[PDB]
TrEMBL record, chains A, B:
The lineage of its organism: Bacteria, Bacillati, Bacillota, Bacilli, Lactobacillales. Keywords: DNA-binding, Repressor, Transcription, Transcription regulation. One of its GO terms (molecular function) is DNA-binding transcription factor activity. Signal peptide: none annotated. This is Ribose operon repressor. It comes from Lactobacillus acidophilus (strain ATCC 700396 / NCK56 / N2 / NCFM).
Amino acid sequence: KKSKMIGIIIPDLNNRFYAQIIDGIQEVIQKEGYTALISFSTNSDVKKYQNAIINFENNNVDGIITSAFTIPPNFHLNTPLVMYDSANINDDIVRIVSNNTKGGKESIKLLSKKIEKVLIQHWPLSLPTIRERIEAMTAEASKLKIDYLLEETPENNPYISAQSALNKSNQFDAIITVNDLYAAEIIKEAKRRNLKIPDDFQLVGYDNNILCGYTSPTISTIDQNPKLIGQTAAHRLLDLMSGNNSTRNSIIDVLPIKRDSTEG
Amino acid sequence: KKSKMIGIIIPDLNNRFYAQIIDGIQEVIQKEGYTALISFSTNSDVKKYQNAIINFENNNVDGIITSAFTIPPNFHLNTPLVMYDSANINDDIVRIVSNNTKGGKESIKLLSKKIEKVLIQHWPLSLPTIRERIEAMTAEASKLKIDYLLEETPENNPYISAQSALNKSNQFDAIITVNDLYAAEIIKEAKRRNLKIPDDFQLVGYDNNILCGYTSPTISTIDQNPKLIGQTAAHRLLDLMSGNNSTRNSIIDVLPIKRDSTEG
């Protein structure tokens, strides 16, 4: 019956965000005698996700924890499953949802009351979690009468994104970008151009990656609580494996952290 | 019968070192249809390593890849095994050995010719790989007539190590510490005390973490190519699983990287 194995799918192993989610998962499941059977994805192909899930089932895992992907019409499995890094989707799958809406709202709230124009660089809005974040940003910006420009940026090139940001920086009072690595690249390019942050413009990133406290200026950001996302995914999975049929989503809080990139 | 599962033991996936080692391992084994069964260690208890190994065997894994630990007198295993993050030990266990000797030697060579006294912070020499690194450092320092002070430092406290380093920095021309995170903490503490690097003293880290290129100054360091360490561990394991009984170790080259923290 039970294998005491939990299947886990992780998309980006080198991102400390996913590293911390896995750390949260293992902390909870290993205490209960489970061992993680982990599959690393090469890309976000839904078919590959389904295939990974099928292989987990062939190995008789007792439960599965996977990063989110759009549920296809033919989706099917007979193993308890929890989806993390998900948007607040009200379907039959238990999802661990970071409060992306609060994240976006708080990103705008980190800006000075004197900010009149902000450049918002973002990943494709086709990504549900990003759409939630950006829609909340434009809503709060509108509430505060802060003009903005949305700019979709590449998903794997912080350098190019930083050039685009600096090229138009004199048109903005602040810049909000996709994550802290992208913010770090913006800081590096600003220095190449002899521009100062926050003097010439305020800067806000996302994640609260360890990098934030080591740059100059330090980076203002939003902490996504990845460890808690992981721990919660594990607890919710254990509940499903214990006969709890609830499909309610767990909403994980996000925390705004003010550093020198906004405060000076 | 084969399970097409490979047991892997690692502390976690946060640091670049372990995340990249796993990246290297998974890249090679998934290509061959294997799935990683990963046990995360909470400490360096040899007994816990042995128990983790027994659990993998009870799960019929086809091979095991683990971080290094001192082999106890009663060590016994009937499953192919490869140890990474190992010193160059000539026993019957296949080990993937980073060239710690070269790493230590090149760390001293990163210092400017003007450097006369260096503070060398290191983890306990009871750790074989660190002993190899430090012994190479003192050998090269002696060759170049550079005076030095060896200071054992905490393994889980970059902050405390940074305070110790700065409290006596006035007595040194350069400081070499355990890794780039520790180096970053030193740069941060140096800023708190209105001291500049390399101005007041040069600095060298280890690991070539992503943050090296985003700090001010950028950090000179040693890249031990963890992805290659992982890929090699997987290749050697597949060889053992193929009847190749050689127990010779694989030595992996390192690459010193000069950045602004050692610019004279």
